[PDB]
Design a protein around this ligand. Sequence first.
Ligand SMILES: O=P(O)(O)O[C@@H]1[C@H](O)[C@H](O)[C@@H](OP(=O)(O)O)[C@H](OP(=O)(O)O)[C@H]1O
Lengths: 9, 150
Amino acid sequence: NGYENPTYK
Amino acid sequence: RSEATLIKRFKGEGVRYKAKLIGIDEVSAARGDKLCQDSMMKLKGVVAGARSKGEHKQKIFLTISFGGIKIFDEKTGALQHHHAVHEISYIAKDITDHRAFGYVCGKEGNHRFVAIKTAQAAEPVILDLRDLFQLIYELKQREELEKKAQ
Ligand SMILES: O=P(O)(O)O[C@@H]1[C@H](O)[C@H](O)[C@@H](OP(=O)(O)O)[C@H](OP(=O)(O)O)[C@H]1O
């Protein structure tokens, strides 16, 4: 699966 | 995975990876598997059609570090793309291809999906990215609880 970046923004 | 060893691993130039640039595409969301699964196929297809004209993907090498993701042209060594960690929102591998992955760059309303074909498996790159993101989050919390506990 994919992984989103917790520090995005 | 010791925070200390992991910090040494991404320090400075960080890890290097030989790969080819499949392409860059403008997308609408900052995340989502299907959306980021579709865009990969669209780019590979553009590439596939180009093979008939003797086209070839640009050979590159990329680095994973505290500077985020950087793409350097293999031939001239020139830095062509520098995507800071805070600008990266989603990481996604390619299910039907173990040697390709992508990620979305950009601020709200101006996203881009970058597709890469790695020389070796894309697994180690996705992993490094994962750890680097988590690391930065942790160091950011701790180094905030401290400044706020001043
Ligand atoms: O053997 P053929 O029929 O020439 O086809 C090549 C083969 O599929 C290589 O694996 C591929 O490199 P990657 O695996 O890194 O894509 C290369 O792409 P390129 O021409 O874009 O380098 C193709 O041209």
